Design a protein around this nucleic acid. Structure first.
Ligand SMILES: [Ca+2]
Ligand SMILES: [Ca+2]
Ligand code: NA
Ligand code: NA
Ligand code: NA
Lengths: 241, 242
DNA sequence: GCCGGTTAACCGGC
DNA sequence: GCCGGTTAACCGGC
């Protein structure tokens, strides 16, 4: 992680800060690691602007130089072909990542999770367990085991008067967690869910092993969900029909 | 529907309306034209508890709904209900409804569906298929077949300069649709999905028939999803762990 | 045309 | 502690 080494710095600047979008972690990152930091759409704009000679989606999709990163970051074919310096990508809540840090052809996908710590703790959607499954599949098929990390920054806040105030933060790395410990909440858009501060970081094996261990986990949890569907959505309603 | 009789009015008033870059506008209109019938869901709960100050605790307060199904559809949780006070009112919350219209103890649950008419069409979450199943089961168990409607108001809008502007609307009633034709998107929080504009409205049966028919549909779709998951989420990935 | 996956967290049961 | 269902619409593949 490019962020981990300066976590103490970030934590100190965020705590006590106030919003009247605490995802102004971007501001700090952009101002301290200006060459590395992009919002996802910015990175895509940047990428395409720097290759004016490349037109149409097929060619622009080659710019990624990576099937896995293509899958994680790129917009759709029509959006890509229609892109121009006069028609730039804008932010979208559907984008995989909030912030991208990129250096030496290595990518850190950062996802900020904001959290009102005044309320009963509710583990947020982290990422589609299905998207992550495809990601691991693609990592394996293309042997891309040293290309990117997916990391999370929890920003805790509470209402104090007229404004929300940050009171703490946490940071963790998806690929340092034990895959079998990942909670997959099928109803909630098949999303993995955890609080960043609770994420175990004790995985010892390789990235490839992580990917293989995750796929086994995912496949296993899918089977369990299908079974659970009978018990929760079928059996209790049989009697009315 | 309490809205239906003035929908022509509603449709005309809303078209041309702008919001700075619409549900609130729908509410304002209903308030002005049906002031006595119109509430935000939290507003209705607040009103109910305000007129029963001697009724404290969640149990006693739950008894005020006088309906298992409505309790299920409208109430807040136990702690929230017990902690309610005049100084600690409910505010907007995954509440079932956007707006309630109630008259003579009949309830219309209204959900506004806003829609960017400029983008590729994408049918939005309408309501949880599972919440709906539970609802149907409670209607049956309690024989509450003439108590409430669940209705939808689509508000189409496009970006025009610095403003969002409404260009058209549509209205439809859930319980007038054919239950077996409702699309359950399991991945999408198990939500029924449709565009209000597209919802068929020719259902021929009683409310109880609707409920039973929906339950059959729900149970069938759940069984098929269970199987589909192996096909979609297991098979394609088994090769990496064989 | 047809089809269904994803982002944002967020409440409250026992 | 442990567990998981709901609201907001929204995008792009053949
Ligand atoms: Ca985020
Ligand atoms: Ca709504
Ligand atoms: Na995410
Ligand atoms: Na709502
Ligand atoms: Na809804």
């Amino acid at each position: 992680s490019f962020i981990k080494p300066i976590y103490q710095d970030i934590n100190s600047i965020l705590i006590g800060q106030k919003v009247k979008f605490e995802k102004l972690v971007y501001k700090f990152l952009k101002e301290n690691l200006s060459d590395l930091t992009f919002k996802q759409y910015e990175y895509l704009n940047d990428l395409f602007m720097k290759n004016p000679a490349i037109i149409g989606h097929e060619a622009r999709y080659k710019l990624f130089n990576s099937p896995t990163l293509l899958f994680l970051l790129s917009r759709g074919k029509a959006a890509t072909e229609n892109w121009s310096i006069e028609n730039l990508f804008e932010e979208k809540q559907n984008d995989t990542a909030d912030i991208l840090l990129v250096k030496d052809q290595f990518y850190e996908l950062l996802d900020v999770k904001t959290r009102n710590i005044s309320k009963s703790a509710f583990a947020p959607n982290i990422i589609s367990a299905y998207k992550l499954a495809q990601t691991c599949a693609k990592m394996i098929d293309n042997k891309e085991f040293d290309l990117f990390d997916i990391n999370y920054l929890e920003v805790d806040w509470e209402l104090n008067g007229e404004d929300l105030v940050c009171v703490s933060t946490s940071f963790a790395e998806l690929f340092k967690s034990e895959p079998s410990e990942l909670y997959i909440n099928w109803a909630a858009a098949m999303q993995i869910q955890f609080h960043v501060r609770d994420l175990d970081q004790g995985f010892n094996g390789t990235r490839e092993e992580w990917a293989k261990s995750y796929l086994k986990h995912f496949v296993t949890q899918a089977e369990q969900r299908a079974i659970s569907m009978i018990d929760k959505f079928v059996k209790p309603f049989k009697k009315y029909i």
